[PDB]
Amino acid sequence: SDAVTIRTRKVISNPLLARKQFVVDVLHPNRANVSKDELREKLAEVYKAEKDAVSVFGFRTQFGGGKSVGFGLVYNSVAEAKKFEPTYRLVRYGLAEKVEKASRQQRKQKKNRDKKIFGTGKRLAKKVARRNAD
Amino acid sequence: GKGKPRGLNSARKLRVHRRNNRWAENNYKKRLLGTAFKSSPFGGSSHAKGIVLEKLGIESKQPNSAIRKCVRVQLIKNGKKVTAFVPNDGCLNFVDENDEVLLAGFGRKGKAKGDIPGVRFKVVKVSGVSLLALWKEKKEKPRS
Amino acid sequence: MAKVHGSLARAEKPKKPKGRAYKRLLYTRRFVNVTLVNGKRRMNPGPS
Amino acid sequence: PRAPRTYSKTYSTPKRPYESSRLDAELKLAGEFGLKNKKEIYRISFQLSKIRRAARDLLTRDEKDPKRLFEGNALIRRLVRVGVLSEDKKKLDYVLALKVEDFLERRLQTQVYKLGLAKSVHHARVLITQRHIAVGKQIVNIPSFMVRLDSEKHIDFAPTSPFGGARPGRVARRNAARKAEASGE
Amino acid sequence: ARGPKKHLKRLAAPHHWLLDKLSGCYAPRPSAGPHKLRESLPLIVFLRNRLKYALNGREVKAILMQRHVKVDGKVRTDTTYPAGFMDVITLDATNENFRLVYDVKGRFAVHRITDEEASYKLGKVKKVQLGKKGVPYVVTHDGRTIRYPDPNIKVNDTVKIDLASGKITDFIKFDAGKLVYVTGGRNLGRIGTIVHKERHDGGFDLVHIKDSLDNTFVTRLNNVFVIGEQGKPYISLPKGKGIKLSIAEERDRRRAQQGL
Amino acid sequence: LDSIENRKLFEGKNGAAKIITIVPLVNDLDPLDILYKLLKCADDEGIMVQEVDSKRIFNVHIKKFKSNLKIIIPDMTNFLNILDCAKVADFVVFGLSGVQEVDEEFGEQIIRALELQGIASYIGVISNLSAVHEKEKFQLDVKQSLESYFKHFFPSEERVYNLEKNSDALNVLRTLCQRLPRSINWRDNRGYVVADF
RNA sequence: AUCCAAGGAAGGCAGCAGGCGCGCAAAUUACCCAAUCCUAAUUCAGGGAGGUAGUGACAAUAAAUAACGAUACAGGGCCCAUUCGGGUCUUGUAAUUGGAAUGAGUACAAUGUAAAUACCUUAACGAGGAACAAUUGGAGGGCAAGUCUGGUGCCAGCAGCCGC
């Protein structure tokens, strides 16, 4: 019964960010919220670009369902997509890696422990190791 | 002409006349002298806490003969000794002495005809506990 | 009196309906069922 | 420290609480229209109060004034769009004889029953709140929708709803499954 | 304050930026530069809010760090650079040009410019004076200081400046019966012809202007800017032509542009 | 001055006797479970090892808040012993199992009897909230059920704390180390000794 | 007011969290720089500014706690009543019966978001609802509501006002 129809509103070519930005309408009768990956594939094949040069985000389904609205970007290459996109959306797309970090309290206390150290500290390390050995 | 000036350059006499005649009101004189901030036992607040010193069998004689159930309290914020009424408990079984009590105001105007008093305050809570839900048996009172 | 530990809602004469059905019931009880007692609409009468 | 987000009240408490004629009239309105609160009447009273204040403070200005003609035409046209004010009454004088029932008749609550889509006004509110009724394509489940006039030829059942479209509901196919199992059993 | 401020809260923004009041909490405080804080327009607002090219704040930074945007011939790298009135914004990779002209409602509007018109720029002379080693100079509305003008140039004269060399091409002296745009105040954004000059010594001067539809209005001398002649502006004017309309006329025009 | 002078019984460095009586109210709840989930958030586990073998009356100095606690666990069959342990306490800890109900014939009678003989400052404590399904979306329902139940008998508290988390357990430990208890009138008029030797 | 080997040495939470005291009176020692902006040598680093979530009946908006039938029985009305009975309604009940509708709640998934939680969607479950149980204050007058029953009448003609 269903046929997922995709429309693009507000189509703007931005050569300054080397891309095209538009509004993604999805008419999906009898479907719940046609996912981002399928939209990336179908916008890559409509606009004849790489899937890695296609981004969609900010979706929301209307009341009652059957229609969803979001925002859509398509770059001119994969490398321009790599150099212009925010890193969180690259991690969402598998086109980069989640940079594993320490917690923020940890690094603040790390910085403030470093602030009590003037120099390399290996001089102080030798002197405290000697005095403990004393 | 109605005993007051009506000249067009006479706003000064009119407003000095109003500021002199507004001291004859009641709420104005209590309000701008800081009466509640000095002598009222709550010190100008809607509630207060205190410690029960006594239970009192006050008597209302005429024309209604009743045994009023009251409590003499010493308030915590002031060091002020205030008697207050406690409702709905014939036994005062939720109240002992040396308990802490949240009091509010209470507008009974007692009569002069038979020396019946209207004390100013009702008991709202004893030992943290809603006195209503005690009397309506919805909570239990920790007894210290 | 005191309700038991099992307050987990997740996992006699009949009741009065609530809200708008109660207003429907009152509209039947005052203006559909006209009860003229001695020339007046008497609500809550005793044995008479 | 942000923009303090604005809001307002929408109903108004009446001045005297116990007034037998008012209680009877309000309850007649609730019975004719299937309400639940007195606040649902007080809302319409408050809105009609603001409209009457706008009207009677535009009446004091003389005609052929741009403010009067401008805001008057805006108000009158906005009332005609929802079918509260009729076509002939497009003057500032007739919005003051406009009463509460004229508003209360223009609800989705009322218009579902009046188009012959429900058996009762109460059944009309029920079919609203159980997500069965669409206006054009968008499904509405607030009875206070206040149908604009041009939206009258769009009220129908939803393509989601079993009355208007797709597969029968939970109880229906549950009973069908029990019938089919018991016929198999 | 114990020193100069560095922030600008979002309610304290100039209202003619049309910033929403629930996006965030602040507005971009414009830097020091060619225009007044109150009447400037920083580059972040012109890229994001009006041309829709940037979605975020850092996309503005990404565009400006690729040297696409020129303000009056020179490349600017500031997020909050005060682009103001009569200024020229050039997008090379887009191949577009913009002149910052007020709309009739008093805010800056998008306004496309040919390459020939983008070469020059007008400016109201705000002071003429005689600087060191006796050289005369003019100082314009944007802070440009030009040495060796024409001696006929007095105060309030509009001077045409060719953006390549930054020299005085030609000028208009402030005479009655010239074409005049209005810079500040209530009547902002209107185009008319000055009737005469009312003169109050020791105080503020006033100017009566009469528009294309013979409505008359009065501003101070500070808010005046000369453009050209009757029907001959030196620049291309935006749509509406600085003609103030009543609300009923605007409403009828809006519903007259609605015929399915 | 008077408020500080009334803390001279409770410098936990020399004459401080902050007596805590830990009563589980459900027999599927261990009192040493509660004691260990308390003293583990103090991070001095030597006390936890030295409290194991065979004792009932513990004399513990916490050097963090520098307080002197005295822990008593009642005999959970002698109801008279439960009464006698709670009538000497400065604090009363109420254990609530998240799975088995408080007994109407055993646990409720403990609650009502101790309450009607007079309780000082008390704490409600859950130790088996994670013995319910591991998602907190259902553990908070059990926690709110226990809070609303404990509100009936004791309205002075509205947080019945979880010992599963460091947060609430450290809160309870801070309460027991610092906070001054309400006084029970009849016993403080006659003087009372707890005695070791 | 803190540490101390007694010689000396450190201190300012009317910043974000949090504690004591105080009082009728007021929240988490959470996550994040993705927004909004700001600072720097500066696109990248930093930001308890700020954003996000928890707690939150401070206020404010919208509005679930049921809706249809058939039966009977009692009526009432509409016209045909010469009488029966011919249908149209509308009540009341009968914890009588029938087939329906749907979210609270649970939850594959997807959307959402820095990551999440929640919302909007949605597979699969989810009610005769004798308990997915609506309360708070009243029933002399002011002021809507008792000409009702029992106990009280030694704590009781009583208590915003008048009071019987």
PDB file of N, CA and C (backbone and C1' of nucleotides) in Angstrom, chain D residues 1-2 8-10 18 20 43 119-120 123 129-130 132 142 144 162 167 169-172 174-175, chain G residues 50-51 59-69 100-103 122-124 126-127 143-144:
ATOM      1  N   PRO D   1      19.093  34.044  33.172  1.00  0.00           N
ATOM      2  CA  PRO D   1      19.096  35.277  32.384  1.00  0.00           C
ATOM      3  C   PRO D   1      18.785  35.015  30.924  1.00  0.00           C
ATOM      4  N   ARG D   2      17.512  35.028  30.551  1.00  0.00           N
ATOM      5  CA  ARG D   2      17.102  34.793  29.170  1.00  0.00           C
ATOM      6  C   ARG D   2      15.963  35.758  28.887  1.00  0.00           C
ATOM      7  N   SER D   8      -0.238  33.636  29.594  1.00  0.00           N
ATOM      8  CA  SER D   8      -1.415  34.338  30.084  1.00  0.00           C
ATOM      9  C   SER D   8      -2.420  33.347  30.650  1.00  0.00           C
ATOM     10  N   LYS D   9      -3.432  33.889  31.318  1.00  0.00           N
ATOM     11  CA  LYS D   9      -4.606  33.115  31.676  1.00  0.00           C
ATOM     12  C   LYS D   9      -5.640  33.207  30.560  1.00  0.00           C
ATOM     13  N   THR D  10      -6.622  32.317  30.604  1.00  0.00           N
ATOM     14  CA  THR D  10      -7.576  32.190  29.513  1.00  0.00           C
ATOM     15  C   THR D  10      -9.025  32.152  29.975  1.00  0.00           C
ATOM     16  N   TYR D  18     -22.397  31.792  43.865  1.00  0.00           N
ATOM     17  CA  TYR D  18     -23.649  31.052  43.932  1.00  0.00           C
ATOM     18  C   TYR D  18     -24.767  31.962  43.456  1.00  0.00           C
ATOM     19  N   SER D  20     -28.265  31.373  41.152  1.00  0.00           N
ATOM     20  CA  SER D  20     -29.017  30.211  40.671  1.00  0.00           C
ATOM     21  C   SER D  20     -29.306  30.259  39.177  1.00  0.00           C
ATOM     22  N   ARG D  43     -13.807  30.364  29.628  1.00  0.00           N
ATOM     23  CA  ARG D  43     -12.885  30.671  28.539  1.00  0.00           C
ATOM     24  C   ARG D  43     -13.576  31.452  27.433  1.00  0.00           C
ATOM     25  N   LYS D 119     -23.500  10.069  16.602  1.00  0.00           N
ATOM     26  CA  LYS D 119     -24.877   9.901  17.036  1.00  0.00           C
ATOM     27  C   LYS D 119     -25.212  10.873  18.156  1.00  0.00           C
ATOM     28  N   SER D 120     -24.229  11.196  18.991  1.00  0.00           N
ATOM     29  CA  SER D 120     -24.406  12.116  20.100  1.00  0.00           C
ATOM     30  C   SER D 120     -23.307  13.162  20.094  1.00  0.00           C
ATOM     31  N   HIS D 123     -20.852  11.423  21.987  1.00  0.00           N
ATOM     32  CA  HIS D 123     -20.204  10.534  21.033  1.00  0.00           C
ATOM     33  C   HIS D 123     -19.319  11.305  20.067  1.00  0.00           C
ATOM     34  N   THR D 129     -11.565  12.576  20.484  1.00  0.00           N
ATOM     35  CA  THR D 129     -10.419  12.319  21.338  1.00  0.00           C
ATOM     36  C   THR D 129      -9.823  10.936  21.132  1.00  0.00           C
ATOM     37  N   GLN D 130     -10.537  10.019  20.474  1.00  0.00           N
ATOM     38  CA  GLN D 130      -9.947   8.739  20.120  1.00  0.00           C
ATOM     39  C   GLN D 130      -9.339   8.747  18.725  1.00  0.00           C
ATOM     40  N   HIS D 132     -10.112   9.744  15.574  1.00  0.00           N
ATOM     41  CA  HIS D 132     -10.830   9.188  14.440  1.00  0.00           C
ATOM     42  C   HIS D 132     -11.162  10.207  13.369  1.00  0.00           C
ATOM     43  N   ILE D 142      -8.421  17.795  19.590  1.00  0.00           N
ATOM     44  CA  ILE D 142      -8.880  18.760  20.585  1.00  0.00           C
ATOM     45  C   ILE D 142     -10.287  19.194  20.195  1.00  0.00           C
ATOM     46  N   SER D 144     -11.918  21.744  21.140  1.00  0.00           N
ATOM     47  CA  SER D 144     -11.927  23.200  21.104  1.00  0.00           C
ATOM     48  C   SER D 144     -11.250  23.742  19.854  1.00  0.00           C
ATOM     49  N   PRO D 162     -10.145   3.057  11.781  1.00  0.00           N
ATOM     50  CA  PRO D 162     -10.852   1.928  11.158  1.00  0.00           C
ATOM     51  C   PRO D 162     -12.192   2.303  10.577  1.00  0.00           C
ATOM     52  N   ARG D 167      -7.035  -1.161   8.833  1.00  0.00           N
ATOM     53  CA  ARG D 167      -7.431  -2.371   9.555  1.00  0.00           C
ATOM     54  C   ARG D 167      -8.172  -2.121  10.866  1.00  0.00           C
ATOM     55  N   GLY D 169      -9.557  -2.228  14.739  1.00  0.00           N
ATOM     56  CA  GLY D 169      -8.767  -1.962  15.920  1.00  0.00           C
ATOM     57  C   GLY D 169      -8.456  -3.161  16.784  1.00  0.00           C
ATOM     58  N   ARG D 170      -8.034  -2.883  18.017  1.00  0.00           N
ATOM     59  CA  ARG D 170      -7.465  -3.901  18.893  1.00  0.00           C
ATOM     60  C   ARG D 170      -8.505  -4.936  19.295  1.00  0.00           C
ATOM     61  N   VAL D 171      -9.657  -4.464  19.773  1.00  0.00           N
ATOM     62  CA  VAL D 171     -10.713  -5.348  20.255  1.00  0.00           C
ATOM     63  C   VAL D 171     -11.309  -6.150  19.106  1.00  0.00           C
ATOM     64  N   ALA D 172     -11.423  -5.528  17.931  1.00  0.00           N
ATOM     65  CA  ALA D 172     -12.021  -6.183  16.772  1.00  0.00           C
ATOM     66  C   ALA D 172     -11.183  -7.362  16.299  1.00  0.00           C
ATOM     67  N   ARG D 174      -8.781  -8.747  17.945  1.00  0.00           N
ATOM     68  CA  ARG D 174      -8.649  -9.687  19.054  1.00  0.00           C
ATOM     69  C   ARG D 174      -9.803 -10.679  19.069  1.00  0.00           C
ATOM     70  N   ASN D 175     -11.031 -10.180  18.903  1.00  0.00           N
ATOM     71  CA  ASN D 175     -12.194 -11.059  18.869  1.00  0.00           C
ATOM     72  C   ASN D 175     -12.197 -11.928  17.621  1.00  0.00           C
TER      73      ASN D 175
ATOM     74  P     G G  50      24.643  31.993  32.812  1.00  0.00           P
ATOM     75  O5'   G G  50      24.588  31.175  31.451  1.00  0.00           O
ATOM     76  C5'   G G  50      23.947  31.720  30.314  1.00  0.00           C
ATOM     77  C4'   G G  50      24.209  30.885  29.092  1.00  0.00           C
ATOM     78  C3'   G G  50      23.412  29.604  29.003  1.00  0.00           C
ATOM     79  O3'   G G  50      22.114  29.825  28.495  1.00  0.00           O
ATOM     80  C1'   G G  50      25.671  29.156  28.525  1.00  0.00           C
ATOM     81  P     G G  51      20.899  28.923  29.001  1.00  0.00           P
ATOM     82  O5'   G G  51      21.134  27.541  28.256  1.00  0.00           O
ATOM     83  C5'   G G  51      20.963  27.460  26.854  1.00  0.00           C
ATOM     84  C4'   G G  51      21.447  26.145  26.323  1.00  0.00           C
ATOM     85  C3'   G G  51      20.753  24.914  26.871  1.00  0.00           C
ATOM     86  O3'   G G  51      19.526  24.640  26.227  1.00  0.00           O
ATOM     87  C1'   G G  51      23.077  24.588  26.929  1.00  0.00           C
ATOM     88  P     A G  59       1.283  27.150  42.362  1.00  0.00           P
ATOM     89  O5'   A G  59       0.930  28.551  41.700  1.00  0.00           O
ATOM     90  C5'   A G  59       0.276  28.610  40.444  1.00  0.00           C
ATOM     91  C4'   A G  59       0.748  29.777  39.616  1.00  0.00           C
ATOM     92  C3'   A G  59       0.249  29.783  38.185  1.00  0.00           C
ATOM     93  O3'   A G  59      -1.037  30.345  38.061  1.00  0.00           O
ATOM     94  C1'   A G  59       2.574  30.087  38.179  1.00  0.00           C
ATOM     95  P     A G  60      -2.203  29.519  37.341  1.00  0.00           P
ATOM     96  O5'   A G  60      -1.768  29.489  35.814  1.00  0.00           O
ATOM     97  C5'   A G  60      -1.567  30.696  35.102  1.00  0.00           C
ATOM     98  C4'   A G  60      -1.085  30.435  33.705  1.00  0.00           C
ATOM     99  C3'   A G  60      -1.847  29.379  32.937  1.00  0.00           C
ATOM    100  O3'   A G  60      -3.069  29.848  32.416  1.00  0.00           O
ATOM    101  C1'   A G  60       0.464  29.054  32.632  1.00  0.00           C
ATOM    102  P     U G  61      -4.262  28.816  32.162  1.00  0.00           P
ATOM    103  O5'   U G  61      -3.866  28.098  30.803  1.00  0.00           O
ATOM    104  C5'   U G  61      -3.747  28.854  29.616  1.00  0.00           C
ATOM    105  C4'   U G  61      -3.273  28.012  28.468  1.00  0.00           C
ATOM    106  C3'   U G  61      -4.096  26.783  28.167  1.00  0.00           C
ATOM    107  O3'   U G  61      -5.274  27.080  27.452  1.00  0.00           O
ATOM    108  C1'   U G  61      -1.811  26.225  28.113  1.00  0.00           C
ATOM    109  P     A G  62      -6.655  26.405  27.890  1.00  0.00           P
ATOM    110  O5'   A G  62      -6.683  25.031  27.090  1.00  0.00           O
ATOM    111  C5'   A G  62      -6.348  24.987  25.714  1.00  0.00           C
ATOM    112  C4'   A G  62      -5.911  23.608  25.306  1.00  0.00           C
ATOM    113  C3'   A G  62      -6.806  22.479  25.771  1.00  0.00           C
ATOM    114  O3'   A G  62      -7.933  22.301  24.937  1.00  0.00           O
ATOM    115  C1'   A G  62      -4.549  21.921  26.175  1.00  0.00           C
ATOM    116  P     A G  63      -9.327  21.840  25.572  1.00  0.00           P
ATOM    117  O5'   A G  63      -9.019  20.401  26.153  1.00  0.00           O
ATOM    118  C5'   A G  63      -8.855  19.287  25.289  1.00  0.00           C
ATOM    119  C4'   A G  63      -8.467  18.054  26.059  1.00  0.00           C
ATOM    120  C3'   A G  63      -9.619  17.386  26.793  1.00  0.00           C
ATOM    121  O3'   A G  63      -9.445  15.976  26.797  1.00  0.00           O
ATOM    122  C1'   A G  63      -7.984  18.095  28.357  1.00  0.00           C
ATOM    123  P     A G  64     -10.722  15.037  26.569  1.00  0.00           P
ATOM    124  O5'   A G  64     -10.241  13.611  27.077  1.00  0.00           O
ATOM    125  C5'   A G  64     -10.858  12.993  28.192  1.00  0.00           C
ATOM    126  C4'   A G  64     -10.255  11.643  28.472  1.00  0.00           C
ATOM    127  C3'   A G  64     -11.005  10.782  29.467  1.00  0.00           C
ATOM    128  O3'   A G  64     -12.060  10.073  28.855  1.00  0.00           O
ATOM    129  C1'   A G  64      -8.722  10.800  30.022  1.00  0.00           C
ATOM    130  P     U G  65     -13.534  10.114  29.473  1.00  0.00           P
ATOM    131  O5'   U G  65     -13.393   9.388  30.882  1.00  0.00           O
ATOM    132  C5'   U G  65     -12.997   8.029  30.968  1.00  0.00           C
ATOM    133  C4'   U G  65     -12.709   7.660  32.393  1.00  0.00           C
ATOM    134  C3'   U G  65     -13.840   7.951  33.361  1.00  0.00           C
ATOM    135  O3'   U G  65     -14.738   6.863  33.448  1.00  0.00           O
ATOM    136  C1'   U G  65     -11.804   8.833  34.202  1.00  0.00           C
ATOM    137  P     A G  66     -16.249   7.071  33.939  1.00  0.00           P
ATOM    138  O5'   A G  66     -17.088   7.041  32.591  1.00  0.00           O
ATOM    139  C5'   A G  66     -17.242   8.221  31.825  1.00  0.00           C
ATOM    140  C4'   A G  66     -16.924   7.994  30.373  1.00  0.00           C
ATOM    141  C3'   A G  66     -18.078   7.575  29.489  1.00  0.00           C
ATOM    142  O3'   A G  66     -18.912   8.662  29.138  1.00  0.00           O
ATOM    143  C1'   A G  66     -16.174   6.272  28.988  1.00  0.00           C
ATOM    144  P     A G  67     -20.457   8.406  28.800  1.00  0.00           P
ATOM    145  O5'   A G  67     -20.429   7.931  27.289  1.00  0.00           O
ATOM    146  C5'   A G  67     -19.875   8.767  26.294  1.00  0.00           C
ATOM    147  C4'   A G  67     -19.858   8.073  24.964  1.00  0.00           C
ATOM    148  C3'   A G  67     -21.148   7.386  24.580  1.00  0.00           C
ATOM    149  O3'   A G  67     -22.084   8.299  24.052  1.00  0.00           O
ATOM    150  C1'   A G  67     -19.319   5.952  24.149  1.00  0.00           C
ATOM    151  P     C G  68     -23.607   7.856  23.882  1.00  0.00           P
ATOM    152  O5'   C G  68     -23.644   7.231  22.424  1.00  0.00           O
ATOM    153  C5'   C G  68     -24.686   6.353  22.056  1.00  0.00           C
ATOM    154  C4'   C G  68     -24.209   5.285  21.117  1.00  0.00           C
ATOM    155  C3'   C G  68     -25.215   4.184  20.865  1.00  0.00           C
ATOM    156  O3'   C G  68     -26.171   4.553  19.899  1.00  0.00           O
ATOM    157  C1'   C G  68     -23.096   3.234  21.304  1.00  0.00           C
ATOM    158  P     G G  69     -27.686   4.802  20.349  1.00  0.00           P
ATOM    159  O5'   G G  69     -28.487   3.626  19.641  1.00  0.00           O
ATOM    160  C5'   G G  69     -28.859   2.468  20.365  1.00  0.00           C
ATOM    161  C4'   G G  69     -28.140   1.245  19.864  1.00  0.00           C
ATOM    162  C3'   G G  69     -28.929  -0.049  19.951  1.00  0.00           C
ATOM    163  O3'   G G  69     -29.739  -0.228  18.806  1.00  0.00           O
ATOM    164  C1'   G G  69     -26.724  -0.374  20.786  1.00  0.00           C
ATOM    165  P     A G 100     -16.429  -7.300  17.481  1.00  0.00           P
ATOM    166  O5'   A G 100     -16.348  -5.739  17.196  1.00  0.00           O
ATOM    167  C5'   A G 100     -15.791  -4.856  18.155  1.00  0.00           C
ATOM    168  C4'   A G 100     -16.325  -3.457  17.989  1.00  0.00           C
ATOM    169  C3'   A G 100     -15.312  -2.344  18.159  1.00  0.00           C
ATOM    170  O3'   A G 100     -14.527  -2.139  17.000  1.00  0.00           O
ATOM    171  C1'   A G 100     -17.262  -1.822  19.380  1.00  0.00           C
ATOM    172  P     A G 101     -12.946  -1.904  17.133  1.00  0.00           P
ATOM    173  O5'   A G 101     -12.836  -0.457  17.774  1.00  0.00           O
ATOM    174  C5'   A G 101     -13.321   0.678  17.078  1.00  0.00           C
ATOM    175  C4'   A G 101     -13.154   1.923  17.903  1.00  0.00           C
ATOM    176  C3'   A G 101     -11.795   2.093  18.550  1.00  0.00           C
ATOM    177  O3'   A G 101     -10.844   2.631  17.660  1.00  0.00           O
ATOM    178  C1'   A G 101     -13.468   2.480  20.153  1.00  0.00           C
ATOM    179  P     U G 102      -9.333   2.101  17.670  1.00  0.00           P
ATOM    180  O5'   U G 102      -8.659   2.899  18.864  1.00  0.00           O
ATOM    181  C5'   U G 102      -8.753   4.310  18.913  1.00  0.00           C
ATOM    182  C4'   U G 102      -8.525   4.812  20.309  1.00  0.00           C
ATOM    183  C3'   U G 102      -7.233   4.367  20.956  1.00  0.00           C
ATOM    184  O3'   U G 102      -6.125   5.137  20.529  1.00  0.00           O
ATOM    185  C1'   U G 102      -9.019   4.109  22.482  1.00  0.00           C
ATOM    186  P     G G 103      -4.631   4.666  20.869  1.00  0.00           P
ATOM    187  O5'   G G 103      -4.317   5.410  22.232  1.00  0.00           O
ATOM    188  C5'   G G 103      -4.446   6.821  22.331  1.00  0.00           C
ATOM    189  C4'   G G 103      -4.603   7.272  23.762  1.00  0.00           C
ATOM    190  C3'   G G 103      -3.311   7.302  24.576  1.00  0.00           C
ATOM    191  O3'   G G 103      -3.399   8.346  25.548  1.00  0.00           O
ATOM    192  C1'   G G 103      -4.833   5.833  25.595  1.00  0.00           C
ATOM    193  P     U G 122       0.961   6.139  14.195  1.00  0.00           P
ATOM    194  O5'   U G 122       1.751   4.760  14.240  1.00  0.00           O
ATOM    195  C5'   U G 122       2.392   4.265  13.075  1.00  0.00           C
ATOM    196  C4'   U G 122       3.435   3.245  13.422  1.00  0.00           C
ATOM    197  C3'   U G 122       2.939   2.066  14.227  1.00  0.00           C
ATOM    198  O3'   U G 122       2.303   1.106  13.410  1.00  0.00           O
ATOM    199  C1'   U G 122       4.983   2.855  15.127  1.00  0.00           C
ATOM    200  P     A G 123       0.982   0.361  13.926  1.00  0.00           P
ATOM    201  O5'   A G 123       1.400  -1.171  13.913  1.00  0.00           O
ATOM    202  C5'   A G 123       2.394  -1.631  14.811  1.00  0.00           C
ATOM    203  C4'   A G 123       3.261  -2.704  14.213  1.00  0.00           C
ATOM    204  C3'   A G 123       3.078  -4.074  14.839  1.00  0.00           C
ATOM    205  O3'   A G 123       2.024  -4.813  14.248  1.00  0.00           O
ATOM    206  C1'   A G 123       5.362  -3.517  14.879  1.00  0.00           C
ATOM    207  P     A G 124       0.795  -5.312  15.150  1.00  0.00           P
ATOM    208  O5'   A G 124       1.495  -6.011  16.394  1.00  0.00           O
ATOM    209  C5'   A G 124       2.111  -7.285  16.277  1.00  0.00           C
ATOM    210  C4'   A G 124       2.546  -7.787  17.624  1.00  0.00           C
ATOM    211  C3'   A G 124       1.494  -7.673  18.708  1.00  0.00           C
ATOM    212  O3'   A G 124       0.604  -8.768  18.686  1.00  0.00           O
ATOM    213  C1'   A G 124       3.544  -6.811  19.503  1.00  0.00           C
ATOM    214  P     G G 126      -3.966  -8.088  24.997  1.00  0.00           P
ATOM    215  O5'   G G 126      -3.943  -6.812  25.948  1.00  0.00           O
ATOM    216  C5'   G G 126      -3.539  -6.914  27.304  1.00  0.00           C
ATOM    217  C4'   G G 126      -3.474  -5.558  27.955  1.00  0.00           C
ATOM    218  C3'   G G 126      -4.625  -4.622  27.639  1.00  0.00           C
ATOM    219  O3'   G G 126      -5.796  -4.895  28.371  1.00  0.00           O
ATOM    220  C1'   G G 126      -2.620  -3.468  27.331  1.00  0.00           C
ATOM    221  P     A G 127      -7.097  -5.416  27.597  1.00  0.00           P
ATOM    222  O5'   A G 127      -8.140  -5.651  28.763  1.00  0.00           O
ATOM    223  C5'   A G 127      -7.867  -5.153  30.056  1.00  0.00           C
ATOM    224  C4'   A G 127      -9.106  -4.588  30.680  1.00  0.00           C
ATOM    225  C3'   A G 127     -10.406  -4.908  29.973  1.00  0.00           C
ATOM    226  O3'   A G 127     -10.819  -6.238  30.259  1.00  0.00           O
ATOM    227  C1'   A G 127     -10.361  -2.626  30.634  1.00  0.00           C
ATOM    228  P     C G 143     -25.805  36.245  49.371  1.00  0.00           P
ATOM    229  O5'   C G 143     -26.335  34.754  49.254  1.00  0.00           O
ATOM    230  C5'   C G 143     -26.191  34.015  48.048  1.00  0.00           C
ATOM    231  C4'   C G 143     -26.049  32.534  48.297  1.00  0.00           C
ATOM    232  C3'   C G 143     -27.033  31.928  49.297  1.00  0.00           C
ATOM    233  O3'   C G 143     -27.373  30.612  48.881  1.00  0.00           O
ATOM    234  C1'   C G 143     -24.830  31.497  49.998  1.00  0.00           C
ATOM    235  P     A G 144     -28.563  30.356  47.836  1.00  0.00           P
ATOM    236  O5'   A G 144     -27.839  29.606  46.633  1.00  0.00           O
ATOM    237  C5'   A G 144     -28.576  28.982  45.593  1.00  0.00           C
ATOM    238  C4'   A G 144     -28.137  27.553  45.401  1.00  0.00           C
ATOM    239  C3'   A G 144     -28.494  26.618  46.544  1.00  0.00           C
ATOM    240  O3'   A G 144     -29.792  26.082  46.380  1.00  0.00           O
ATOM    241  C1'   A G 144     -26.206  26.367  45.998  1.00  0.00           C
TER     242        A G 144
END
